[PDB]
């Protein structure tokens, strides 16, 4: 298994100031962590569960 484009890029908390608790795939660990996002200028390795990074990242 490979996964997809979106779960390689690098984990970014973003430009704002509030939190929302996160998952994002550690490519490099092939497990999905948790990760608390700023609100705004992220990128795609974000899910807000768990179940949807694994679907994704890992084709669960």
């Given at each position: 298994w490979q996964p997809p484009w979106y779960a390689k890029e690098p984990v970014r908390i973003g430009s704002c100031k509030k939190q929302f608790s996160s998952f994002y795939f550690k490519w490099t660990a092939k497990?999905?962590?948790?990760?608390?996002?700023?609100?705004?200028?992220?990128?795609?390795?974000?899910?807000?569960?768990?179940?949807?990074?694994?679907?994704?990242?890992?084709?669960k």
């Amino acid at each position: 298994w490979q996964p997809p484009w979106y779960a390689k890029e690098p984990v970014r908390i973003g430009s704002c100031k509030k939190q929302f608790s996160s998952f994002y795939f550690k490519w490099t660990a092939k497990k999905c962590l948790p990760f608390l996002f700023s609100g705004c200028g992220g990128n795609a390795n974000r899910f807000q569960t768990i179940g949807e990074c694994r679907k994704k990242c890992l084709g669960k």
